[PDB]
Structures are given as C-alpha cells and as structure tokens.
C-alpha cells in the first residue's frame, strides 16, 4: 500500500430527514456522500428506498422508507 489523498475542509450536509417510526436507521450523522440505510423486524416488508444517497443539495434523492407486509415463508 501507499499514501493517499490529503486535505482538510469543512462540509455541509443534506439535512435532518429524521427517522421513520416503522424501522431503525443507521447513521445519525448526514454528510455529503453519506448513505443512510434502514431495516425492519419480522412480520414486516420493506416499503420504499432501502438506502438513499445524499445529493449535496440540501436534499435527499428519496424519502425515508417504511415497514409493512406479511411474512416470507
């Protein structure tokens, strides 16, 4: 392995899309280029964008997901 890129600078971030009341989110922090994923327990099916990606435009590509649906097996 070898050295990499350097440089220290402050960055903004999409915003505070909050957390859904149907599942759990991973990544309380939201930076430019960060991906926020979600998950739902049993007796629930993913109903939306499993994981979104910031657009460095004070906005998100999609809204928070959801949880609703029967079992699988």
Curated annotation (Swiss-Prot):
Weakly expressed in most tissues, except in brain. Expressed at intermediate level in brain, including cerebellum, substantia nigra, hippocampus and fetal brain. It comes from the Eukaryota. Residues 12-67 form the Sushi domain. It is found in: Membrane. Disulfide bonds join 14-54, 40-67. Potential suppressor of squamous cell carcinomas. Belongs to the CSMD family. CSMD1 may be a candidate for oral and oropharyngeal squamous cell carcinomas (OSCCs). PubMed:12696061 and PubMed:14506705 are however in disagreement: while PubMed:14506705 considers CSMD1 as a strong candidate for OSCCs, PubMed:12696061 thinks it is not. This is CUB and sushi domain-containing protein 1. It comes from Homo sapiens (Human). The lineage of its organism: Eukaryota, Metazoa, Chordata, Craniata, Vertebrata. The chain holds residues 521 to 580 of 3564 of the full protein.
């Amino acid at each position: 392995g070898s050295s990499g890129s350097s440089g220290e600078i402050e960055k903004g971030g999409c915003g505070d899309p909050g957390i859904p009341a149907y599942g759990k989110r991973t990544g309380s922090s939201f930076l430019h280029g960060d991906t926020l994923t979600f998950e739902c327990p049993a007796a629930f099916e993913l109903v939306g964008e499993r994981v979104i990606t910031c657009q460095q435009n004070n906005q998100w590509s999609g809204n928070k997901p959801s949880c609703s649906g029967p079992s699988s097996g």
